Amino acid sequence: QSNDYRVVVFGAGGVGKSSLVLRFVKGTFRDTYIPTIEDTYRQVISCDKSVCTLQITDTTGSHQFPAMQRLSISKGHAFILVFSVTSKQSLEELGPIYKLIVQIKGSVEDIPVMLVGNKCDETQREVDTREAQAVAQEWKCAFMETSAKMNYNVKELFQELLTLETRRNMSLN
Ligand SMILES: Nc1nc2c(ncn2[C@@H]2O[C@H](COP(=O)(O)OP(=O)(O)O)[C@@H](O)[C@H]2O)c(=O)[nH]1
Numbered sequence: 328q329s330n331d332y333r334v335v336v337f338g339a340g341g342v343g344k345s346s347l348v349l350r351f352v353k354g355t356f357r358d359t360y361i362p363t364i365e366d367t368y369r370q371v372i373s374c375d376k377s378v379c380t381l382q383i384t385d386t387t388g389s390h391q392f393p394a395m396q397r398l399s400i401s402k403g404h405a406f407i408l409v410f411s412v413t414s415k416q417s418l419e420e421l422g423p424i425y426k427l428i429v430q431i432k433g434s435v436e437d438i439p440v441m442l443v444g445n446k447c448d449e450t451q452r453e454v455d456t457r458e459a460q461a462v463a464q465e466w467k468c469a470f471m472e473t474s475a476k477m478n479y480n481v482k483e484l485f486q487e488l489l490t491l492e493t494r495r496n497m498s499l500n
């Protein structure tokens with residue numbers, strides 16, 4: 328019997344969802360020319376004095392058919408909501424999915440939800456760190472800034488996400 332812990336990665340096109348997931352799971356880059364289609368990646372992790380598979384779903388963002396978004400949330404245990412610090416529009420585009428997550432799971436307080444400001448290697452920002460912190464405070468969720476490019480806070484994101492789950496004791500080690 329498999330005991331998968333399922334993480335779904337949401338966000339607008341171009342924010343770095345695929346780059347975050349590939350940096351974490353494979354230590355590699357997103358090849359621009361590979362076809363844009365949902366994939367799920369597997370990583371073995373420690374869970375409850377044993378092992379389980381972390382399943383990470385790299386969604387296609389605004390291309391994802393809404394019924395498929397619903398199914399992804401229903402199947403998911405934890406959520407990573409990625410925006411680019413260079414795009415205020417990308418942060419705004421998380422509104423609908425956050426709402427649907429909270430509605431389907433009943434409350435933000437009952438599952439791990441992480442707001443992620445990716446591309447924090449960039450100097451021309453549209454969303455300040457303090458602004459993103461306020462969003463997360465108002466949404467009652469966690470927040471982290473990352474650079475997939477620089478491998479900055481990439482392992483830390485998944486570790487913190489796993490630590491937020493109170494029903495299992497999970498670790499990357
Ligand atoms: N500067 C910078 N660019 C990034 C970062 N992560 C991804 N990108 C670039 O942003 C573009 C979109 O990345 P991608 O992973 O395909 O985003 P997705 O559409 O959200 O899956 C690509 O050109 C990436 O090289 C980052 O941390 N910093």
Ligand SMILES: [Mg+2]
Nearest residue numbers: 344345386387
């Ligand atoms: Mg992608």
